[PDB]
Ligand binder design. Sequence first.
Ligand SMILES: CNS(=O)(=O)c1ccc(-c2ccc(/C=C3\SC(=N)NC3=O)o2)cc1
Lengths: 258, 296
Amino acid sequence: VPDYHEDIHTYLREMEVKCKPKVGYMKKQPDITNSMRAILVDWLVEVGEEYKLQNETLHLAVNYIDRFLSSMSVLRGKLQLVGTAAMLLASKFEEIYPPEVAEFVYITDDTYTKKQVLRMEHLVLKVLTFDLAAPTVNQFLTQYFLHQQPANCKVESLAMFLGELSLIDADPYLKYLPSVIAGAAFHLALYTVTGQSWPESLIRKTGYTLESLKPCLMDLHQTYLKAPQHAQQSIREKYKNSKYHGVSLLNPPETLNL
Amino acid sequence: MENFQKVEKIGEGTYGVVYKARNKLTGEVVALKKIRLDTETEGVPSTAIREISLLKELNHPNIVKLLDVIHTENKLYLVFEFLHQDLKKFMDASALTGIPLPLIKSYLFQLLQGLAFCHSHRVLHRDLKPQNLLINTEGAIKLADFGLARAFGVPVRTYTHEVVTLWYRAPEILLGCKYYSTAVDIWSLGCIFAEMVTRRALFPGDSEIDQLFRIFRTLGTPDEVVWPGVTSMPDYKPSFPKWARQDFSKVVPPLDEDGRSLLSQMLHYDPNKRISAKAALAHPFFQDVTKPVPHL
Ligand SMILES: CNS(=O)(=O)c1ccc(-c2ccc(/C=C3\SC(=N)NC3=O)o2)cc1
């Protein structure tokens, strides 16, 4: 029931175009690959669970990593040091109780030192020029749920499950804006659970129709069917749990009739 | 840090210490906020991470302008515009003379300006109080000190409980609600608006319950009629004395009718009925608002 509902939504739309990472930065990274990115993101998911961090924190760390990797080349051995420090920052920005640094050093298994992580935090802050308040799928999803009647938190967890799967697979998902993936995901979540669709209210708020969501909806649908087959299974493990109503266990629908 | 001539220490914080400085090259007087990193333990404090990143996104005439960050490995300085003094020091200058009503009406319009910008950019300030409010010789007022601020979400999701100075803290934090949005900055502004008028603090409690009772004595103890839901908040106790609402001509004697109305809508118990900053702007109080200088 905000007062600045519309203003905030508009601002986040302006903002997400500016905070976008560049689509194909991976094609220009000599030593790392989408495949290595995926192991890192999925590891992040696991860290998120262990220290019970908000899903937003995870979305921001992926934002800061994709952005950082658009400006800097990194070696595979240093890739995890960028992930850690990205998560430490998203922790400081978003958490009430961010983990201590030493606990970050602990979860790398001493792959790096206290001072390496600190120094990497500096660098990330420099390259990101301190622009840390990114819009995420998450921020759009929470807004979009407000249009759901009567409420249904199975639809809501599944939409968060789907939006989280999007973080693993740079290809294709970087081709999309957070508002688009959140649109797609939400529609997918509604449809799987109650058979309904992207409500005309959200058509109004966002200006997206099912027509304009279709590209991302295809991909998300694939990703979701091939979920159990995926090399990374952390997000599925996370969402089997009774917190998120066991949504990773619902049968995807087989067709979307569009 | 070579270009800065530190001129005098001007105050404090907790991670940080404030100075007046000048560029030895452009001549510009700035404010330098030093934070200690001590280069080994914790790294960059999150009040600083918060402050810098939020400020980057909040450029507006009524909000300190961030000019620069200098990241000397183990001290971190922030360079702000230098405004001339804070509102508390001003209030202390003049609490006997009164602050003229035109100036008050003007400072408030401008805090409502810059505060509505925040709320539209999903930032809560969370520590409004006159020592955080800065004034310049030409009539301007700017919200400053964003270390305690935070980017919020729609709808909200449970931020730091331990929040807003005390004399300024809204009843919903006092009573330990789980959610709290943009109304908390409004409450504070009400207290602010009131403190400029009477020159005493509106609610100077010495503990949380003291704080509450002072609110209750002044605005009447709330019930299910004036605030649906109070009776079941975590810190509510049915044994709260039941006081009646005072009359505002008694609480803020010097304030005309349109004013008390607004202050009143600013101080509503129900965060959902408490006037937002944007609606507060289009209030009758603001028929003909000027920009006076401070004649001190
Ligand atoms: C208490 N001394 S004073 O009123 O004369 C005074 C206080 C502050 C400033 C000043 C200039 C710039 C800033 C910036 C600040 S203050 C704060 N708590 N956070 C800031 O960012 O603060 C100038 C005079």
